[PDB]
Enzyme design. Structure first.
Site, short mmCIF file in Angstrom:
data_model
loop_
_atom_site.label_atom_id
_atom_site.label_comp_id
_atom_site.label_asym_id
_atom_site.label_seq_id
_atom_site.Cartn_x
_atom_site.Cartn_y
_atom_site.Cartn_z
N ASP A 127 -19.27 11.23 29.24
CA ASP A 127 -20.63 10.99 28.80
C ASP A 127 -20.79 9.49 28.58
OD1 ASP A 127 -20.50 13.82 28.63
OD2 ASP A 127 -21.44 13.89 26.61
N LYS A 189 -28.58 13.16 29.06
CA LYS A 189 -28.22 13.58 27.70
C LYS A 189 -29.07 12.80 26.74
CE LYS A 189 -24.32 13.21 24.40
NZ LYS A 189 -22.89 13.14 24.21
N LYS A 218 -28.19 17.70 28.48
CA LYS A 218 -27.39 17.97 27.28
C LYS A 218 -28.16 17.48 26.08
CE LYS A 218 -22.81 16.99 25.04
NZ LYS A 218 -21.50 16.29 25.23
#
Lengths: 257, 258
Positions: A127, A189, A218
């Site tokens: 990430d 995300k 996400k």
């Protein structure tokens, strides 16, 4: 070459404008799913401890909690990837780490090296944080190359781009999604949890709407309860980033079990 | 080998215990300097913008303010070191950046590469973050090697170690300073500004007292006013990390004169 990069910057700007025009004419906020059960929530959870003061013992506890609750994965800082991999060896629980995190303001080559190092140490997914300052300055080609370098460096592995929704206006959120998709990332995300705000259903849904069914969203930052997790999934989240997964599961079993 | 690392770990433990002993027997909190003027404050300031939403324009403004006010340096995120260097060409204003920042939890080699890249890009000094969790686990040798690898990788450039005082008890603050000194760092620094607290006079003095007069202490986090800056220098700070440098200077001029 400048010529090539200038042209590419121009095509990114036109793709962003196309998305903004479609959003303005056709967008509507509503759920993507009818409901979400306990098992759906477990399967979405990436059980996280990114605290600077976390110890090896804390990580061992986090991996144990992920096993016990059947979470999708754990998310740890890069220094603890090897440890997490050893603790979870033999299970299907993924190890996720963070790159250029939480500020996103590293040199692109450092992000790319950190990602390579993480995969070598055993990470399944990365990430990364977008360069928010450069996005805000409309330096689309810079932001593009910054994400692209990371994606290409760990090709074959999942890369999620944290756009840090709390610092962006609507058009910048749209630009971040479009650039992340063009660069070959797998997820976008919402948040680092270290900014001024976290996941909202409004942001999550906009993101999923822009990126489509084939790219993940996400939801992260401030997801504390079962109701929070269900809401985020109902509005299009494919994964949840949280450190509260134990309480999320307990609330789900208590109030909805 | 593991024997050598083990023996070194034990050595560090003994140095920490010696420092804690000295602290328990002899420490007294009091000022190191009787006052500080506007020129002292200007010379101490590292004028900082590490906001993730900082733009190139924001950085150009930061560098202008540093030239106008004759601050010691600017402190910027690594992506902006080459920009800051260009903006300051022809002046001796330092370009400072941050490594493994703010969480201190990257793999050591990532910190070492980030430091090398920053120096290649034009940084004069590096402020790295200690691995707080490994310090709290008393993994002294890990923490030592993490700092040492950075220091050696940029030999000849100043390295500051951010110990992040808000997450540490007194003995851990001592341990962080002792380790930073043993690993060859040039400064210890209080705070990232992204934790739960910033600089205090009590922390600054304690750190200066442990590291002594040949190592520096940089006070950072929550330093807003001229009076705050003066206080930190009076209790042992050699450098000040702040984004409030313009108001700090204007404040001292308005209330105390040029």
């Amino acid at each position: 070459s400048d010529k090539i990069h200038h042209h590419h910057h121009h095509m990114i700007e036109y793709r962003i404008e196309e998305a903004v025009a479609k959003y303005r004419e056709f967008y509507e906020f509503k759920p993507v799913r009818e409901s979400a059960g306990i098992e759906d929530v477990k399967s979405a959870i990436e059980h996280t401890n990114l605290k600077p003061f976390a110890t090896p013992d804390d990580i061992k506890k986090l991996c144990l909690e992920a096993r016990e609750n059947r979470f999708h994965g754990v998310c740890v800082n890069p220094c603890y990837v090897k440890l997490a991999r050893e603790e979870l060896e033999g299970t299907d629980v993924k190890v996720v780490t963070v790159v250029g995190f939480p500020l996103g303001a590293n040199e692109t080559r450092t992000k790319a090296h950190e990602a390579i190092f993480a995969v070598e140490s055993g990470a399944d997914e990365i990430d990364m944080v977008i360069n928010v300052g450069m996005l805000k300055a409309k330096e689309w080609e810079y932001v593009y190359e910054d994400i692209r370098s990371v994606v290409e460096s760990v090709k074959g592995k999942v890369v999620k781009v944290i756009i840090e929704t709390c610092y962006l206006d609507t058009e910048e959120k749209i630009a971040a999604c479009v650039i992340s998709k063009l660069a070959g990332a797998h997820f976008v995300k919402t948040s680092t949890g270290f900014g001024t705000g976290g996941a909202t259903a409004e942001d999550v849904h906009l993101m999923k709407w822009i990126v489509g069914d084939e790219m993940g969203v996400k939801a992260s930052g401030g997801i504390r309860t079962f109701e929070d997790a269900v809401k985020m999934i109902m509005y299009g989240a494919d994964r949840i980033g949280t450190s509260s997964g134990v309480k999320i599961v307990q609330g789900g079993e208590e109030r909805y079990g």
